[PDB]
Amino acid sequence: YQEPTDPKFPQQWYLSGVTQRDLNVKAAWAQGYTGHGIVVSILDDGIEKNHPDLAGNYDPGASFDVNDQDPDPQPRYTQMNDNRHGTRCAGEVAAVANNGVCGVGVAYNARIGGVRMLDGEVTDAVEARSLGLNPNHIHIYSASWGPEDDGKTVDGPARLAEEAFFRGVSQGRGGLGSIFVWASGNGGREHDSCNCDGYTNSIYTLSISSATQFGNVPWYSEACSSTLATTYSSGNQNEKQIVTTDLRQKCTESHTGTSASAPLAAGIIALTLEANKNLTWRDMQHLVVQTSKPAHLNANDWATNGVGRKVSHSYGYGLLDAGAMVALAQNWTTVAPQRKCIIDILTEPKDIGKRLEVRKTVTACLGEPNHITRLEHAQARLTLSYNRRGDLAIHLVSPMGTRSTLLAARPHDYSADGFNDWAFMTTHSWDEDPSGEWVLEIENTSEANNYGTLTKFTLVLYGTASGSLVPR
Numbered sequence: 001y002q003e004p005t006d007p008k009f010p011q012q013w014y015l016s017g018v019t020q021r022d023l024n025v026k027a028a029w030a031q032g033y034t035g036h037g038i039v040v041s042i043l044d045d046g047i048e049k050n051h052p053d054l055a056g057n058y059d060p061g062a063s064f065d066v067n068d069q070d071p072d073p074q075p076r077y078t079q080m081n082d083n084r085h086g087t088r089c090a091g092e093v094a095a096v097a098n099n100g101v102c103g104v105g106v107a108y109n110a111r112i113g114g115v116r117m118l119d120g121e122v123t124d125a126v127e128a129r130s131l132g133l134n135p136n137h138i139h140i141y142s143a144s145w146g147p148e149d150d151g152k153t154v155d156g157p158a159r160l161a162e163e164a165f166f167r168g169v170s171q172g173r174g175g176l177g178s179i180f181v182w183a184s185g186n187g188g189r190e191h192d193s194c195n196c197d198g199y200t201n202s203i204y205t206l207s208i209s210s211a212t213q214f215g216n217v218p219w220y221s222e223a224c225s226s227t228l229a230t231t232y233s234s235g236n237q238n239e240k241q242i243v244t245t246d247l248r249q250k251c252t253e254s255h256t257g258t259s260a261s262a263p264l265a266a267g268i269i270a271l272t273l274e275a276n277k278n279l280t281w282r283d284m285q286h287l288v289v290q291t292s293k294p295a296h297l298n299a300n301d302w303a304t305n306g307v308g309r310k311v312s313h314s315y316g317y318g319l320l321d322a323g324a325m326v327a328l329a330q331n332w333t334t335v336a337p338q339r340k341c342i343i344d345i346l347t348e349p350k351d352i353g354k355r356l357e358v359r360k361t362v363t364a365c366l367g368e369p370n371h372i373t374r375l376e377h378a379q380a381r382l383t384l385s386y387n388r389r390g391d392l393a394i395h396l397v398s399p400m401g402t403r404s405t406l407l408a409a410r411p412h413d414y415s416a417d418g419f420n421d422w423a424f425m426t427t428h429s430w431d432e433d434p435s436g437e438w439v440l441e442i443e444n445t446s447e448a449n450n451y452g453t454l455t456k457f458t459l460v461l462y463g464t465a466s467g468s469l470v471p472r
């Protein structure tokens with residue numbers, strides 16, 4: 001195998017590293033996987049389709065302009081170069097290799113397109129038409145943004161966009177399901193807590209956080225239980241950043257944030273899909289859980305879950321490992337159909353006050369076709385009132401003892417509107433048996449005499465009843 005000759009490939013440290021601080025992408029290339037036949041679309045501010053490092057892989061069938069309602073996602077050029085982000089992300093996935101220009105994409109033989117959707121008012125219809133673009137042609141969608149990362153917003157897909165997620169994972173990709181890759185957020189300095197973002201908090205999105213070059217949690221990172229894994233991105237000014245294509249046929253060395261991590265993951269998922277085109281949307285999440293690597297990622301919350309895997313709210317299961325992903329994909333056995341076990345927990349509303357604990361022992365739908373012995377995602381769908389929402393912290397403990405943070409205190413969130421059937425999601429109990437005692441903890445982290453009431457707690461379990469591996 002001959003590594004790329006592109007002039008900035010040596011600067012793509014998160015691919016070309018020889019120090020083991022990389023995504024292990026060369027190992028996938030050397031197994032023969034480069035993204036050939038796979039189609040990825042960047043949901044963002046447009047894509048410079050004539051960029052010298054994108055044109056050779058550009059796919060009009062992976063593109064649309066939902067801001068101006070036409071097929072051409074070319075960015076709107078401005079003095080401040082506002083609409084450059086989709087072009088940066090596109091090159092992360094699929095910049096052309098061995099052509100003397102900039103660097104390379106993770107999946108440098110994949111086809112790449114973009115939906116111009118963020119350069120205008122982002123409505124529910126705009127979101128739905130983007131998520132649902134050409135779902136039997138596009139395999140993988142990459143989205144780096146969501147509701148405001150101000151540390152005080154709770155929002156997610158409205159009805160059309162949520163319908164687009166369900167249609168995508170159910171009928172998309174010939175019934176195997178669209179793969180939606182999401183950035184978990186850039187709200188770290190606002191103390192944002194990313195289960196409050198219903199896009200990354202969705203089970204239908206494969207959610208990705210960031211690590212700095214020296215292996216630390218970047219200033220912009222949001223911790224939450226819905227995240228599944230990590231790719232490298234930017235950090236402090238002694239740490240390198242992401243190197244990729246830029247607007248006006250240029251090359252940047254200063255692409256940053258969790259919004260630069262999701263495209264790298266989308267590229268790795270493209271290599272993995274080339275290795276096994278029959279993988280379902282759930283299969284892909286299983287592969288990420290099983291192959292991602294905690295080693296040398298620094299966090300104070302690494303915890304071993306009930307099946308022996310280390311998990312962090314900053315990093316999920318750790319750094320994506322492209323060589324391991326493509327190796328495990330090749331002989332992967334499709335998972336069983338998804339079961340869903342609904343458990344209404346409360347027998348009466350509960351005052352929250354300073355602290356509330358709710359304990360319930362469940363059988364996880366024993367005796368039913370939705371019996372789950374092998375968990376995937378779990379949700380605590382909560383309806384509660386509180387006088388100042390950001391003073392709340394919420395934890396969920398599984399029968400195996402895994403403590404998922406559902407919500408951390410958000411100092412800027414002054415809302416008195418509480419949570420209205422908000423489906424807080426955790427990935428940290430993946431492959432555990434969910435039968436037994438679950439514990440929900442709601443705590444007032446402030447010294448103020450805050451008040452409110454929990455009126456509904458639905459525990460929703462997803463998973464199967466077959467196929468488990470020996471614990472790690």
Ligand SMILES: COCC[NH+]1CCN(c2ccc(Oc3cc(C[N@H+]4CC[C@H](CNC(C)=O)CC4)cc(-c4cc(Cl)cc(Cl)c4)n3)cn2)CC1
Binds near residue numbers: 131
């Ligand atoms: C270098 O940085 C470049 C600068 N760039 C500027 C533009 N930008 C940006 C602009 C707007 C933005 O707003 C948003 C805001 C949302 C949240 N939703 C919630 C539902 C709401 C409609 N409720 C109802 C009841 O009907 C409409 C807004 C979602 C997304 C979103 C959705 C999808 Cl499916 C894919 C992607 Cl990608 C984003 N997007 C997020 N980001 C990102 C930064």
Ligand SMILES: *[C@@H]1O[C@H](CO)[C@@H](O)[C@H](O)[C@H]1NC(C)=O
Binds near residue numbers: 278334
């Ligand atoms: C894809 O997986 C399904 C489910 O196991 C199987 O029935 C089908 O034969 C597979 N298709 C290919 C082309 O391998």
Ligand SMILES: [Ca+2]
Binds near residue numbers: 065068071074
């Ligand atoms: Ca256009």
Ligand SMILES: [Ca+2]
Binds near residue numbers: 006096100103104
């Ligand atoms: Ca190149």
Ligand SMILES: [Ca+2]
Binds near residue numbers: 192
């Ligand atoms: Ca956020």
Ligand SMILES: [Cl-]
Binds near residue numbers: 340
């Ligand atoms: Cl469902």
Ligand code: NA
Binds near residue numbers: 146147184186
């Ligand atoms: Na965000």
Ligand code: NA
Binds near residue numbers: 182199200201206207
């Ligand atoms: Na997700």
Ligand code: NA
Binds near residue numbers: 303304306400402
């Ligand atoms: Na444990």
Ligand code: NA
Binds near residue numbers: 399433435436437
């Ligand atoms: Na149990």
